[PDB]
Tab-separated table of C-alpha atoms and ligand atoms in Angstrom:
chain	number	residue	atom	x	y	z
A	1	UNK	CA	-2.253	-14.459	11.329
A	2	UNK	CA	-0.283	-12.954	14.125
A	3	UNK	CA	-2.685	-9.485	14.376
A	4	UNK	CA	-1.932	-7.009	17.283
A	5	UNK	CA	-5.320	-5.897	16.579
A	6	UNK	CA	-8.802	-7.055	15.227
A	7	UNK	CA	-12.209	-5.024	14.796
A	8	UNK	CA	-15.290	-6.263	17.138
A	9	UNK	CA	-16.763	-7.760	13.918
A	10	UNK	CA	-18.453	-10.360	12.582
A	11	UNK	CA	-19.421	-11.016	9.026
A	12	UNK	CA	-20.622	-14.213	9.225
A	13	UNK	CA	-23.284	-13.071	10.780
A	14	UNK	CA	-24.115	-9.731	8.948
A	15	UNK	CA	-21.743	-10.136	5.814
A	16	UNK	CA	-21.228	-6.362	4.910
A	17	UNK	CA	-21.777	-5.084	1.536
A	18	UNK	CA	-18.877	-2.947	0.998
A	19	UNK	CA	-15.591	-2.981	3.903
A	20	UNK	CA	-13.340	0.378	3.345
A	21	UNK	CA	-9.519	-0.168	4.605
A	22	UNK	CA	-8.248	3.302	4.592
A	23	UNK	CA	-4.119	3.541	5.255
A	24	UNK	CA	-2.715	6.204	7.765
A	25	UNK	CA	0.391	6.607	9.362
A	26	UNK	CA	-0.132	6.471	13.628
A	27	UNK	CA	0.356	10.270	13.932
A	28	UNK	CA	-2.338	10.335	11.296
A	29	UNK	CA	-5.190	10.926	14.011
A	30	UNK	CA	-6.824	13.987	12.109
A	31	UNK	CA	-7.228	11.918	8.868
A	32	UNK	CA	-8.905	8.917	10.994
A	33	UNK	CA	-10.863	11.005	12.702
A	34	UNK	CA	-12.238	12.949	10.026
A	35	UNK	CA	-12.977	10.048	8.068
A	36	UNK	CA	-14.744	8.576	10.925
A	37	UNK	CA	-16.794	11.420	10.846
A	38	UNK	CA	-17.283	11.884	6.934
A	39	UNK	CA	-17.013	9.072	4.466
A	40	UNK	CA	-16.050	6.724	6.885
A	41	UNK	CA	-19.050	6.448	9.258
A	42	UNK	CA	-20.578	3.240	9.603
A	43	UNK	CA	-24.347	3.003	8.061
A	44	UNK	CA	-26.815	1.328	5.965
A	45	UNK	CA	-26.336	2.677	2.144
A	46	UNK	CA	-29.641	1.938	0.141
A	47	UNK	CA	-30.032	-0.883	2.678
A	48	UNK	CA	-26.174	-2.332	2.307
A	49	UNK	CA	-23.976	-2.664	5.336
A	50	UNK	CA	-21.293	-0.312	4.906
A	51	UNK	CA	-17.761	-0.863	7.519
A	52	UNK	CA	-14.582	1.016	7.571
A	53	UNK	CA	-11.610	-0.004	9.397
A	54	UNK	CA	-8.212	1.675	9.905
A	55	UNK	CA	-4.842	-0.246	8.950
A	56	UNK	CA	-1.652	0.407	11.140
A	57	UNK	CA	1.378	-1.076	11.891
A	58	UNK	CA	3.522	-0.437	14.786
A	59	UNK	CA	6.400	2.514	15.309
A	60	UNK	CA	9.508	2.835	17.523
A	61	UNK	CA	7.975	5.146	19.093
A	62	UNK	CA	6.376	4.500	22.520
A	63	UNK	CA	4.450	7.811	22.395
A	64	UNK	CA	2.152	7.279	18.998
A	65	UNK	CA	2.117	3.164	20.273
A	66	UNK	CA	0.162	4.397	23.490
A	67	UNK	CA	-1.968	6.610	21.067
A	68	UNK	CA	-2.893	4.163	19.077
A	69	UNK	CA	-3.224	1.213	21.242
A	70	UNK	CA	-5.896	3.575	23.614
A	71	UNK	CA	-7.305	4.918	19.681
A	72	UNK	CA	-7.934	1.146	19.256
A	73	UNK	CA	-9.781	0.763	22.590
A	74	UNK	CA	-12.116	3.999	21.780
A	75	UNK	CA	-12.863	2.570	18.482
A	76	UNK	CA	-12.612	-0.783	17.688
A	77	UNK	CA	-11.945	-0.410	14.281
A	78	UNK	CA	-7.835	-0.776	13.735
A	79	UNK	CA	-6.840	-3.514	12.045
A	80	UNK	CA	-2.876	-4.015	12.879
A	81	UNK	CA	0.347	-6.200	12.779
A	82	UNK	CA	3.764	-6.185	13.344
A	83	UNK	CA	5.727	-4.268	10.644
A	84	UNK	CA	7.608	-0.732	10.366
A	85	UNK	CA	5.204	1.254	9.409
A	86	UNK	CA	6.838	4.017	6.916
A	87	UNK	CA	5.858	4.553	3.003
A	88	UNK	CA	8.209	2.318	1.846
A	89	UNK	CA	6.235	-0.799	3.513
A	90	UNK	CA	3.053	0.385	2.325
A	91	UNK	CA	2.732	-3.179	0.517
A	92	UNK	CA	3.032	-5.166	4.309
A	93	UNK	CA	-0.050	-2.589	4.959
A	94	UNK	CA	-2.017	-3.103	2.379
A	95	UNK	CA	-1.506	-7.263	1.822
A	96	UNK	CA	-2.256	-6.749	5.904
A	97	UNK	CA	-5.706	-5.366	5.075
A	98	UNK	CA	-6.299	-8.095	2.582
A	99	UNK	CA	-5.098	-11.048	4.418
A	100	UNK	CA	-7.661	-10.150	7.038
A	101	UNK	CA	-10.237	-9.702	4.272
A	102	UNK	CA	-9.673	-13.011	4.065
A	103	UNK	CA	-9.366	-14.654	7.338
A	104	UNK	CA	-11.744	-12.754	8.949
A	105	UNK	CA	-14.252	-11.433	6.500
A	106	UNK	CA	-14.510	-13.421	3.088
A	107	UNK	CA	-18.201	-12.662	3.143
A	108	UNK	CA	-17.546	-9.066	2.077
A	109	UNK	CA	-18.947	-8.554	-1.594
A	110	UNK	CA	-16.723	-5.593	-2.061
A	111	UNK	CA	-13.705	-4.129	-0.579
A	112	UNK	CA	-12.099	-0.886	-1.229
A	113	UNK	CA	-8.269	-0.049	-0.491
A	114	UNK	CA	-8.083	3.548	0.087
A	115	UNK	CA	-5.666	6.665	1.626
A	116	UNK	CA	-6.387	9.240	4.040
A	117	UNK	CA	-5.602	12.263	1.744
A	118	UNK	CA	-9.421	11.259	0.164
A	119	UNK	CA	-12.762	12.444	-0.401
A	120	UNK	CA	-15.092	9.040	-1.117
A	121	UNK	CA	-18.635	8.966	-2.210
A	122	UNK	CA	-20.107	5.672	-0.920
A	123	UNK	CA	-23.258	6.250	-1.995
A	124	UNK	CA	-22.432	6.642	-5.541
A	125	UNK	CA	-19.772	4.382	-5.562
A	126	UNK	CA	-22.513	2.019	-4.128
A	127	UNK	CA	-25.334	2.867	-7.054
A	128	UNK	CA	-22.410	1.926	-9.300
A	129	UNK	CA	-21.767	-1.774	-7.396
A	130	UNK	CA	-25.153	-2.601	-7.731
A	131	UNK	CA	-25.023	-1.742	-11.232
A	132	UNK	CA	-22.078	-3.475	-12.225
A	133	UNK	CA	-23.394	-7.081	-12.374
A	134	UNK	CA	-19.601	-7.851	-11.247
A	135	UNK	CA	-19.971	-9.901	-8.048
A	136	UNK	CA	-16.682	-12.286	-8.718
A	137	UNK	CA	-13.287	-11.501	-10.170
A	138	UNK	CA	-13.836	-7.654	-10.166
A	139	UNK	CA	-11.352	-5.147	-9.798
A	140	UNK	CA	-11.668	-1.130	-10.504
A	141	UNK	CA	-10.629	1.877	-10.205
A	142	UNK	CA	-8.595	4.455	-12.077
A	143	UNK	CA	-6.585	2.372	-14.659
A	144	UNK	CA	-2.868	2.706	-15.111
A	145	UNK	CA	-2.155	0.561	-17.873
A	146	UNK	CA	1.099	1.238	-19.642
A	147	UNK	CA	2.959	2.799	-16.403
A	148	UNK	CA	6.899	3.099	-16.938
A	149	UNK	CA	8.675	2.930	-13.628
A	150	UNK	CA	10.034	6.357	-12.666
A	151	UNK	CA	13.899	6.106	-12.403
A	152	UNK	CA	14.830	9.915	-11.179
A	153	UNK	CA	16.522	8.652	-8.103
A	154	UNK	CA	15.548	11.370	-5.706
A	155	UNK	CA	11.322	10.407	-6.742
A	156	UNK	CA	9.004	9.456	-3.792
A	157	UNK	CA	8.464	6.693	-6.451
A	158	UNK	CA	11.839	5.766	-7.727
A	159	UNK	CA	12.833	1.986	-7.997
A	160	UNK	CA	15.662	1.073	-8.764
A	161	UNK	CA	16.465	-1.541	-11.924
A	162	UNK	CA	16.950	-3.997	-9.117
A	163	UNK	CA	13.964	-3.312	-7.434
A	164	UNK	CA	12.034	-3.882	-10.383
A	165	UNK	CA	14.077	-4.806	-13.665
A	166	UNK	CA	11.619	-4.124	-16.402
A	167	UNK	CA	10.531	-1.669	-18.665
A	168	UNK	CA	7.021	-1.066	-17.929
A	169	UNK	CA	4.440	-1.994	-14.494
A	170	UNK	CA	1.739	-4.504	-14.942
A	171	UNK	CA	-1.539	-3.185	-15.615
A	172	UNK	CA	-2.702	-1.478	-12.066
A	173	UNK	CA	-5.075	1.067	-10.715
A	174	UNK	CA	-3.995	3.901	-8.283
A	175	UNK	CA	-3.434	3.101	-4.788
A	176	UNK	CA	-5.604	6.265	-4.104
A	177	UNK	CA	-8.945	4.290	-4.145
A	178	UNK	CA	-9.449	0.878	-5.545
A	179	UNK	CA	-12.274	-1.678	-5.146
A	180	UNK	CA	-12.757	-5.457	-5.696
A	181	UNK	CA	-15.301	-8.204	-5.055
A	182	UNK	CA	-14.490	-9.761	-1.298
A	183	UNK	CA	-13.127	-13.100	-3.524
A	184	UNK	CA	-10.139	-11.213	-4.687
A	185	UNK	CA	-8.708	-10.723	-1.648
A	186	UNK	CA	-7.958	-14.900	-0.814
A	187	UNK	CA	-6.844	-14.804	-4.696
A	188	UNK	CA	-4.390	-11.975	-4.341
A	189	UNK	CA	-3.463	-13.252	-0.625
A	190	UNK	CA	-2.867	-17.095	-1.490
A	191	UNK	CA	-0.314	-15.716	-5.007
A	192	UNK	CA	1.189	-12.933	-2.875
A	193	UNK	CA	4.517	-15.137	-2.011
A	194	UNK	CA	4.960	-16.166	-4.952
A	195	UNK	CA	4.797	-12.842	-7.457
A	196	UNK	CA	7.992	-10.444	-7.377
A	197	UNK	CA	7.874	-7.916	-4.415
A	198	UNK	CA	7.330	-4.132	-4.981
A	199	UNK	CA	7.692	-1.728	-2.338
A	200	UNK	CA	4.471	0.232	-4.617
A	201	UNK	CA	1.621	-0.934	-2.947
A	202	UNK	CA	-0.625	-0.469	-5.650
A	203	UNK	CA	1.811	-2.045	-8.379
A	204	UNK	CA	2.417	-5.025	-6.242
A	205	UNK	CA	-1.489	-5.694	-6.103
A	206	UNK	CA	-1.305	-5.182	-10.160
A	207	UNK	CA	1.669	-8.167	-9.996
A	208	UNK	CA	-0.808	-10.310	-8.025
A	209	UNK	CA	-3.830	-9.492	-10.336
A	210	UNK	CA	-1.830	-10.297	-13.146
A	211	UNK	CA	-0.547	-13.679	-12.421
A	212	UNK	CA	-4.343	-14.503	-11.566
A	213	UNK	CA	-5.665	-13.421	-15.475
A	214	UNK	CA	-7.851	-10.834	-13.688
A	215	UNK	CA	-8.515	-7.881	-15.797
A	216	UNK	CA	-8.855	-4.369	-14.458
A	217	UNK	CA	-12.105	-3.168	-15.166
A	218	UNK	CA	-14.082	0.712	-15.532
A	219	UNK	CA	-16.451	1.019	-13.071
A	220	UNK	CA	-18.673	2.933	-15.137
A	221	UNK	CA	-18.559	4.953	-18.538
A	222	UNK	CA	-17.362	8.165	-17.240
A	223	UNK	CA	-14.722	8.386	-15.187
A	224	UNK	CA	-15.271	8.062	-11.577
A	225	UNK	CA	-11.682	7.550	-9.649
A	226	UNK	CA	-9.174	11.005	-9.848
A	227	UNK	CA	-5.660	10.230	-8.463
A	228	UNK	CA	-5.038	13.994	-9.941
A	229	UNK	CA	-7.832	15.901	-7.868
A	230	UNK	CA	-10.809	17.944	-8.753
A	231	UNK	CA	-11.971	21.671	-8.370
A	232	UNK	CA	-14.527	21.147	-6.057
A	233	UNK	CA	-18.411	21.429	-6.820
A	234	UNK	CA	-21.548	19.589	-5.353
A	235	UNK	CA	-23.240	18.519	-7.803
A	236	UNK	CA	-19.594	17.358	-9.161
A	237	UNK	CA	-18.608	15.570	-6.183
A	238	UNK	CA	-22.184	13.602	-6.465
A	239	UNK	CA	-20.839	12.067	-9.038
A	240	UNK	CA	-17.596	10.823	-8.342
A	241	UNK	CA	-16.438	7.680	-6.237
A	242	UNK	CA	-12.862	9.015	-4.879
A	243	UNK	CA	-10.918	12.063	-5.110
A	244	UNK	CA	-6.916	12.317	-4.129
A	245	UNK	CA	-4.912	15.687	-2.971
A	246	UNK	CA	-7.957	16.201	0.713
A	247	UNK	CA	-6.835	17.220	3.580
A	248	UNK	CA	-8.864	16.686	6.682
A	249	UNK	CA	-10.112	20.095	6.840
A	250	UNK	CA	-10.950	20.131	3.570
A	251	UNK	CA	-12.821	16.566	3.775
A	252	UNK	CA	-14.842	17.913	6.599
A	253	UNK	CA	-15.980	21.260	4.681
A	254	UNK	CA	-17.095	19.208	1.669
A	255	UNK	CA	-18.697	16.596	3.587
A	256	UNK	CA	-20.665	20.051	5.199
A	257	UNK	CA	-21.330	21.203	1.785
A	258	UNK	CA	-22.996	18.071	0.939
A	259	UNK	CA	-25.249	17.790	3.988
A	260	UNK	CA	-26.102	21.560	3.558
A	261	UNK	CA	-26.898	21.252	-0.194
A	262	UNK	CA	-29.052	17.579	0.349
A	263	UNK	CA	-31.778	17.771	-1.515
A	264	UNK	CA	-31.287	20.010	-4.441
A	265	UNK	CA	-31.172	18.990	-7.688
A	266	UNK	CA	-28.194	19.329	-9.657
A	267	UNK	CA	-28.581	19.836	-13.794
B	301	UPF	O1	3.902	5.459	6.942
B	301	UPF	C1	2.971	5.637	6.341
B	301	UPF	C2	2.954	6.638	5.358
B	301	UPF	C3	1.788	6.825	4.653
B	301	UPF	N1	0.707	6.060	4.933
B	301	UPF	C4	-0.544	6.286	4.130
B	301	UPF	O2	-0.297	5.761	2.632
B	301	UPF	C5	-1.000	6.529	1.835
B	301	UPF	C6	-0.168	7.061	0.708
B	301	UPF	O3	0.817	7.951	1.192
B	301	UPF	P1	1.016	9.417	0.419
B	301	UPF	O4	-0.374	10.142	0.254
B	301	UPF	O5	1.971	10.282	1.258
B	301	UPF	O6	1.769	9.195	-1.068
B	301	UPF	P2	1.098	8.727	-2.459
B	301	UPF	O7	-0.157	9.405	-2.738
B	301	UPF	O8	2.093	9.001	-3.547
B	301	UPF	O9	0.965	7.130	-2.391
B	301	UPF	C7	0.731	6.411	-3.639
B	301	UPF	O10	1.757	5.400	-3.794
B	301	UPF	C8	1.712	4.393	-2.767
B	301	UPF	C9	2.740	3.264	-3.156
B	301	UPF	O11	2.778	2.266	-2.134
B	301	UPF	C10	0.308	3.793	-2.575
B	301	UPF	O12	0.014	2.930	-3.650
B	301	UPF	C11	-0.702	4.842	-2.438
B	301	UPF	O13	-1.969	4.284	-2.223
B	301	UPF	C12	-0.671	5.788	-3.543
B	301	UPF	F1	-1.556	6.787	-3.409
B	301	UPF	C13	-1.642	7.649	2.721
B	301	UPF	O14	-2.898	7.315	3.005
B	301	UPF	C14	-0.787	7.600	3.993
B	301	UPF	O15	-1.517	8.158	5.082
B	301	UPF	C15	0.758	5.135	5.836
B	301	UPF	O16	-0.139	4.499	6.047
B	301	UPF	N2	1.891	4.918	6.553
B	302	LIG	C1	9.268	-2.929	7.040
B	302	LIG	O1	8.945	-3.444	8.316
B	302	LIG	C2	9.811	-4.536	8.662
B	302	LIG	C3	9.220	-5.199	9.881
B	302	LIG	O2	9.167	-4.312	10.985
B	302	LIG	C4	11.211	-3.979	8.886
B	302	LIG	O3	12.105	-5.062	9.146
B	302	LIG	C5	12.650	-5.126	10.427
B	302	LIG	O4	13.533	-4.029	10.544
B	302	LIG	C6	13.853	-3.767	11.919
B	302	LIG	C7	14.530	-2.422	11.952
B	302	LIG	O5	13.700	-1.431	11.358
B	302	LIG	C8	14.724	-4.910	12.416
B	302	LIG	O6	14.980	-4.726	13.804
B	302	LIG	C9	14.005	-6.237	12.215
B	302	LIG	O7	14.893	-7.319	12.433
B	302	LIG	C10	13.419	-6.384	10.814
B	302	LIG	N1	12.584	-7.561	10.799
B	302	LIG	C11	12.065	-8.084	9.693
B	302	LIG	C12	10.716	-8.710	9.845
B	302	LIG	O8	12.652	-8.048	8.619
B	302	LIG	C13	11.668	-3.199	7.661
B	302	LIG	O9	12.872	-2.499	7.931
B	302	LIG	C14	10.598	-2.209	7.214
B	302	LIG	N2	10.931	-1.600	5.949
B	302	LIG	C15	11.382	-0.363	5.764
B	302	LIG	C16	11.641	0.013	4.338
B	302	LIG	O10	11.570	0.416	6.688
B	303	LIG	C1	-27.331	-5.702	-15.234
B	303	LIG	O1	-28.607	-6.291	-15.392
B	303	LIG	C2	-29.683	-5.334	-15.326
B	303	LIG	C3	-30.962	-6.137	-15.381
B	303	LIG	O2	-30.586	-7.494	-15.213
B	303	LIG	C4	-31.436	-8.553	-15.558
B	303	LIG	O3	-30.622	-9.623	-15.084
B	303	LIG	C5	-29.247	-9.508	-15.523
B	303	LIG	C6	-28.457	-10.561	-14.784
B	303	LIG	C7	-29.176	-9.657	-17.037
B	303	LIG	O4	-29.525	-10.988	-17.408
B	303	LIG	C8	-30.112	-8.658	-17.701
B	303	LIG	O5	-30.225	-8.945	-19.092
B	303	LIG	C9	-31.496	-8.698	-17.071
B	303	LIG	O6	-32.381	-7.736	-17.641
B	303	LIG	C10	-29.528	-4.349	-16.477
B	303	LIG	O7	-30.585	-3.394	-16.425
B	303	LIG	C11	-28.194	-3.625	-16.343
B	303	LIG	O8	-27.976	-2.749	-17.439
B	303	LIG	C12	-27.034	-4.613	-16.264
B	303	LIG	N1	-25.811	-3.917	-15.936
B	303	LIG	C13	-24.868	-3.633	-16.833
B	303	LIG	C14	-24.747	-4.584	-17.984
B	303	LIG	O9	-24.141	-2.653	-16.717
B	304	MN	MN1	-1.585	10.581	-1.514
C-alpha cells in the first residue's frame, strides 16, 4: 500500500476488539503523548483488546521528519504514508487509516476515527458496543444529517461551489469521534475512487457511506458524541463516549479526576 510506517501488530492472531486512529499533525507530540497516557493506552476493557495507533503523513520539514521517524521507533504505533500533511488533506489521512484497517487489520470488530483535541471514554463507549447488537454495517456517532456547506470564503470549512456543487452534504457524523464495525472500512476503501472527493474528511466518509446504502446510526438513546464540548463533571464524563474543544493539559487533569474519583457512585 506504499506505508512509510506500520505498527508491530498482528490481528490475525489477537483480532482486537476496538482499534482507535487518532489524527495529529507531526508537531502534535503533546496530544500523542497525552493520549498515550490517557484514553489511548493499550489494555484489556471488560476483557476486549483495546489498540490505538497514531496517523501521520510526512512534512517538508526535516526537523519534525527526524521527530517523528525516532517517535515511531519509541513507539511502534504510527501508522504513515506519503502525503502533505496539512488540514486540507485530512481526507488522504483518514482513507490512510482505513485502507490499513483493511489491509492489515480486517479482523477489528470496531474502529473509531478520532482527533487529538478529545477526551474518549472507552469503557463506556465499549458497554455501549457490546450492547448494540451491530457487528456488520454499523456506523455512529454524532449525526449531521441535513448539513449545508458553509460558503463564507474566509471559513476553516469553506468549499467552494466547485469543490462541492450542491446544496446540502450527505448524511455524516463529525469527524471529532466516529466508530464503525472493522467491515466498513474495505466497503468505504474499495468505493473511495469512485465517490466525488471532499477535502472534509468526515463528509467524504458520509459520500462513501452513502453510495454503500449504509445508514448512520445512534449509538445509544441519549446522546453520547459532543462535537460542541461539555462543562466538565465526573460522573458526566462517565457517561459520554467523546468530547471535542481538550487540550492536552486538560485531557490529562480529567483523566486524573477520573482515577481519583474511581469508585464512587454517581446519582
Ligand atoms: O495537518 C494537520 C492538521 C490537523 N490534524 C488533526 O485533524 C484534526 C482536526 O483538526 P482541527 O481540530 O484543527 O479542526 P476541526 O475540529 O474543525 O476538524 C473537523 O473538520 C475536519 C475536516 O476534514 C475533520 O473532519 C475533523 O475530524 C473535524 F473535527 C485534529 O486532530 C488535528 O490534530 C492533522 O492531523 N494534520
Ligand atoms: C496533499 O498531499 C499531496 C501529496 O503530498 C500534495 O501533492 C503534492 O504536492 C507537492 C507540493 O506540495 C508536489 O511536489 C507533488 O508533486 C504533489 N504530488 C501529488 C501526489 O499530487 C498536495 O499538495 C497536498 N494538498 C494540500 C492541500 O496541500
Ligand atoms: C441485544 O440482545 C440482548 C439479548 O440478546 C438475546 O440475543 C439477541 C441476539 C436477541 O435475539 C435478543 O432477543 C435475545 O434476548 C438484549 O438484552 C438487548 O437489549 C439487545 N440490544 C439492543 C436491542 O439494544
Ligand atoms: Mn477539532
Amino acid at each position: 500500500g506504499n506505508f512509510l510506517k506500520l505498527p508491530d501488530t498482528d490481528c490475525r492472531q489477537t483480532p482486537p476488539f476496538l482499534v482507535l486512529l487518532v489524527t495529529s499533525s507531526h508537531k502534535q507530540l503533546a496530544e500523542r503523548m497525552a493520549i498515550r497516557q490517557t484514553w489511548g493506552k493499550e489494555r484489556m476493557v471488560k476483557g476486549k483488546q483495546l489498540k490505538t495507533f497514531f496517523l501521520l503523513g510526512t512534512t517538508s520539514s526535516a526537523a519534525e521528519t527526524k521527530e517523528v521517524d525516532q517517535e515511531s521507533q519509541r513507539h511502534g504505533d504510527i501508522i504513515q504514508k506519503d502525503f502533505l500533511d496539512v488540514y486540507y488533506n485530512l481526507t488522504l489521512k483518514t482513507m490512510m487509516g482505513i485502507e490499513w484497517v483493511h489491509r492489515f487489520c480486517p479482523q477489528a470488530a470496531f474502529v473509531m476515527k478520532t482527533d487529538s483535541d478529545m477526551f474518549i471514554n472507552v469503557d463506556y463507549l465499549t458497554e455501549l458496543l457490546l450492547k448494540k447488537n451491530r457487528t456488520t454495517r454499523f456506523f455512529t456517532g454524532f449525526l449531521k444529517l441535513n448539513e449545508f456547506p458553509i460558503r463564507q470564503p474566509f471559513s476553516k470549512w469553506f468549499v467552494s461551489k466547485s469543490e462541492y456543487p450542491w446544496d446540502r452534504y450527505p448524511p455524516f457524523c463529525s469527524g471529532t469521534g466516529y466508530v464503525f464495525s472493522g467491515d466498513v472500512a474495505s466497503q468505504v476503501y474499495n468505493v473511495s475512487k469512485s465517490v466525488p472527493y471532499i477535502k472534509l474528511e468526515d463528509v467524504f466518509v458520509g459520500l462513501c457511506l452513502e453510495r454503500l446504502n449504509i445508514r448512520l446510526e445512534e449509538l445509544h438513546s441519549q446522546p453520547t458524541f459532543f462535537p460542541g464540548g461539555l462543562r466538565f463533571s465526573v460522573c458526566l464524563f462517565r457517561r459520554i463516549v467523546a468530547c471535542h474543544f481538550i487540550k492536552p493539559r486538560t485531557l490529562l487533569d480529567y483523566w486524573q479526576a477520573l482515577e481519583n474519583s474511581r469508585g464512587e457512585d454517581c446519582p
